[PDB]
Enzyme design. Sequence first.
Site, PDB file in Angstrom:
ATOM      1  N   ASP B  87       8.038   0.898   0.196  1.00 28.18           N
ATOM      2  CA  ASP B  87       6.582   0.942   0.776  1.00 28.18           C
ATOM      3  C   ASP B  87       5.805   0.433  -0.413  1.00 28.18           C
ATOM      4  O   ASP B  87       6.117   0.514  -1.594  1.00 28.18           O
ATOM      5  CB  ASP B  87       6.168   2.468   0.972  1.00 28.18           C
ATOM      6  N   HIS B  89       1.713   0.612   0.062  1.00 29.82           N
ATOM      7  CA  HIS B  89       0.865   1.366   0.538  1.00 29.82           C
ATOM      8  C   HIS B  89      -0.506   0.997  -0.110  1.00 29.82           C
ATOM      9  O   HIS B  89      -1.070   2.024  -0.732  1.00 29.82           O
ATOM     10  CB  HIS B  89       1.189   2.739   0.422  1.00 29.82           C
ATOM     11  N   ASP B 115       5.095  -1.122   5.529  1.00 30.78           N
ATOM     12  CA  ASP B 115       4.301  -0.014   4.742  1.00 30.78           C
ATOM     13  C   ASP B 115       3.401  -0.568   3.699  1.00 30.78           C
ATOM     14  O   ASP B 115       3.151   0.147   3.004  1.00 30.78           O
ATOM     15  CB  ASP B 115       4.888   1.265   4.584  1.00 30.78           C
ATOM     16  N   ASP B 118      -2.692   1.296   3.970  1.00 33.64           N
ATOM     17  CA  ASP B 118      -2.960   2.613   4.149  1.00 33.64           C
ATOM     18  C   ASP B 118      -2.846   3.366   2.832  1.00 33.64           C
ATOM     19  O   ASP B 118      -1.740   3.124   1.984  1.00 33.64           O
ATOM     20  CB  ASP B 118      -2.124   3.354   5.018  1.00 33.64           C
ATOM     21  N   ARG B 119      -3.518   4.212   2.388  1.00 36.50           N
ATOM     22  CA  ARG B 119      -3.367   5.280   1.149  1.00 36.50           C
ATOM     23  C   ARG B 119      -3.797   4.687   0.133  1.00 36.50           C
ATOM     24  O   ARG B 119      -4.572   5.336  -0.563  1.00 36.50           O
ATOM     25  CB  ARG B 119      -1.782   5.650   1.089  1.00 36.50           C
ATOM     26  N   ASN B 147       5.875   1.748   9.720  1.00 33.89           N
ATOM     27  CA  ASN B 147       5.260   2.763  10.717  1.00 33.89           C
ATOM     28  C   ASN B 147       3.712   2.824  10.573  1.00 33.89           C
ATOM     29  O   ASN B 147       3.026   3.157  11.662  1.00 33.89           O
ATOM     30  CB  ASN B 147       5.713   4.296  10.812  1.00 33.89           C
ATOM     31  N   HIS B 148       3.154   2.327   9.147  1.00 34.80           N
ATOM     32  CA  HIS B 148       1.706   2.106   9.248  1.00 34.80           C
ATOM     33  C   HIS B 148       1.400   0.846   9.812  1.00 34.80           C
ATOM     34  O   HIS B 148       0.005   0.744   9.784  1.00 34.80           O
ATOM     35  CB  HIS B 148       1.529   2.323   7.675  1.00 34.80           C
ATOM     36  N   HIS B 196      12.575   0.239   8.425  1.00 38.95           N
ATOM     37  CA  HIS B 196      11.796   0.981   7.517  1.00 38.95           C
ATOM     38  C   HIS B 196      12.339   2.368   7.683  1.00 38.95           C
ATOM     39  O   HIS B 196      12.162   3.142   6.526  1.00 38.95           O
ATOM     40  CB  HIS B 196      10.235   0.785   8.153  1.00 38.95           C
ATOM     41  N   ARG B 251       7.821  14.650  10.562  1.00 36.95           N
ATOM     42  CA  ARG B 251       6.991  13.569  11.060  1.00 36.95           C
ATOM     43  C   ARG B 251       6.184  14.082  12.196  1.00 36.95           C
ATOM     44  O   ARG B 251       4.984  13.657  12.514  1.00 36.95           O
ATOM     45  CB  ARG B 251       7.867  12.413  11.368  1.00 36.95           C
ATOM     46  N   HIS B 278      10.301   4.195   3.467  1.00 36.44           N
ATOM     47  CA  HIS B 278       9.533   5.239   4.401  1.00 36.44           C
ATOM     48  C   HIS B 278       9.462   6.871   3.770  1.00 36.44           C
ATOM     49  O   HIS B 278       8.512   7.446   3.807  1.00 36.44           O
ATOM     50  CB  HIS B 278      10.442   5.679   5.754  1.00 36.44           C
TER      51      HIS B 278
HETATM   52 FE   LIG Z   1       5.424   5.329   3.436  1.00 30.58          FE
HETATM   53 ZN   LIG Z   2       6.560   5.087   6.634  1.00 29.36          ZN
END
Ligand SMILES: [Fe+3]
Ligand SMILES: [Zn+2]
Lengths: 166, 378
Positions: B87, B89, B115, B118-119, B147-148, B196, B251, B278
Site C-alpha cells: 500500500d 495510500h 491501494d 485514500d488516507r 480495495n481502495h 491485494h 473488515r 492490505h
Molecule cells: Fe490498505
Molecule cells: Zn487494502
Amino acid sequence: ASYPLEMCSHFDADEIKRLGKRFKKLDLDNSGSLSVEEFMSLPELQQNPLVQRVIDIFDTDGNGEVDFKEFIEGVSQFSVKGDKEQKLRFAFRIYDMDKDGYISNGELFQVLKMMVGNNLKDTQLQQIVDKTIINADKDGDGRISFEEFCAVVGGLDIHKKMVVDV
Amino acid sequence: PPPPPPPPPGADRVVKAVPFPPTHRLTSEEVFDLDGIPRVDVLKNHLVKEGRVDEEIALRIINEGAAILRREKTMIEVEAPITVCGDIHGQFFDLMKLFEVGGSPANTRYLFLGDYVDRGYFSIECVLYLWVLKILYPSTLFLLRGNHECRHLTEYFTFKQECKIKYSERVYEACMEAFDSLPLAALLNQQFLCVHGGLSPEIHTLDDIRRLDRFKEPPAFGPMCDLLWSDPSEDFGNEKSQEHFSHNTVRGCSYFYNYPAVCEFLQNNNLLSIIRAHEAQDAGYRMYRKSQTTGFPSLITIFSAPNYLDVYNNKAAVLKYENNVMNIRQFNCSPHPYWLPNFMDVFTWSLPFVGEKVTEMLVNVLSICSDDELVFSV
Ligand SMILES: [Fe+3]
Ligand SMILES: [Zn+2]
Ligand SMILES: [Ca+2]
Ligand SMILES: [Ca+2]
Ligand SMILES: [Ca+2]
Ligand SMILES: [Ca+2]
C-alpha cells in the site's frame, strides 16, 4: 446643545436610544469614547482572541477608541436587518489588518495565529496559509480581494450566524 | 507616473523559510514532448514542489494509463527480477523514497499491489505519477487493483474530496474509470500469486481468477470482492479451528483465511507462496508460517507506506526478487507538507470560529444593561 451626529445604520430611534444606554454604562470615565481597557473590564471578554480585531474595525477614524457613532455603525453590521454582503465584508475585515482591501499572506497568518495559538506548528500554519492563498488568488498579486474571499466562503452561510438583538 | 505595483507576494510571509508552492499549473507543452510522450522528471519535480497540473493533462494521463491497463489480462504474468510493493495510500513523499530505495523505473521492474489512494493527502499525485510511469514503461511497471481503488471507498474517505479541491469531479470520474481497468492479480515467475487481499472460498484454481470480469465497481461479496478484501486469520498457522474461511469480523465484509486454506491452494496450483498487502505491518513486511513441503513461507505481506497515517511509526518495505533470492528492503518515512483535514482552506476552517467569537463578544457587550433601558482546533 451639541451638534447632531451623522451616521448610517439599520436602527430606528428607539434602538439607537437603547444602544445609547449601553454605551454610557460602558464608558467608565464618561468621556464619550470607549477605550480598549473599558472593553476588557467585561470579564467574559478577557479570553476572547478577537476582541482587539473587533475594536479595530469599529474604530473607523483610527484614533484607538470607539465613539458613539462608531459604536452604532459597528453594531449595525450585526443587525437582523443587515444583508449577506455586509456580514461578509465585516468578516473580511477581521483578516484585513491594515485595511488596504486585500488580505495578504502575513495578515492571514497572524490572525489565524491569534485563534489557533499552538495547535499547529508555525510551519504547518504557513503551509496551509500559502495553499489557501494560491487556490483563491485569481489575479496573481499574491493576496485576496473581497471578491476572491467571497468566492471562497459565499456559500458557507456564516452570515446567518452573526446577528445580535438590540 | 503610474500607481506602484502590488508588494511582492510573501513580502510579509511570517515563516519565510518554508518553501512556497508553484502558482502555475504545468501545461501540455511542458509535460508532453513532440511524440506525445510525457516527461517524468518535469512532472515529478513539479509535484514534489506541491505544484498542480492543467486539468487537460490530468485527464490525459489518467485516460492513457487506463487504456493501457484495460488491455492487460485480469491476471497478468510477470517475471523476475522484480520489486513488489504494498500500500501507498496517498503517501507521495514516501513514494519518492520508495523509488530511491527500489531503483529507477527506467531500468527496474516494478509490481504494485494496489491501494494508491485514500488516507494520505497526496493521492492524486501518486496516481498521476504512477500512471505516467505506466505510460512510459508499460512492460516493466505493473499496477494491481487494491480495495481502495473503487467508488464506495474513495467517496467515503478523502479521495473524491481531494479531486474536487485540487482538480475536478471530471478527474475523479476519469480515475474511477481507470481503476475499473486495473488487473486484479499477478502470477510472478510461475511461483507466486500476487493480489491485494488474498483468497476466496469461491476461488480454487488460477483460472477462477482469469475468468473474472474486472471492469466494474467491486461487489459487496463474491470472488472479486474477496481478492481485494480478505485477510489471513489473526492466528494464521496456529489456528485452533480447521475452518478454511470464516467471516471477516474486522473488515465487516469478505473473509479470513486459514493456513489450511492457503496450503490447499498452493498445493493444487503448484505455487510457492501468496504475496499480498492490505494489512499494515510495523516492520513493513511479515512472513507467515512456512509450508512443510517447501520450507518456504506460505504467505507474505508487503506494506509500503511508512509511518502510516503519521501515527503508526512503522517501517515500510518493498520486496526485491532477483537471482533466486527474495530480499526485503526496508525504509523509513519522509517529511511531507501539511494539509487541513478534508482539504479545507483556512477561511472555510476559521470563518465559523470568527463568527462565534465576534457575535459572542457583541452579545456580551449588549447585555451590560438587563432591561434597564426598557481556543481553535484542527
Ligand atoms: Fe490498505
Ligand atoms: Zn487494502
Ligand atoms: Ca472612555
Ligand atoms: Ca474612534
Ligand atoms: Ca492588507
Ligand atoms: Ca488577488
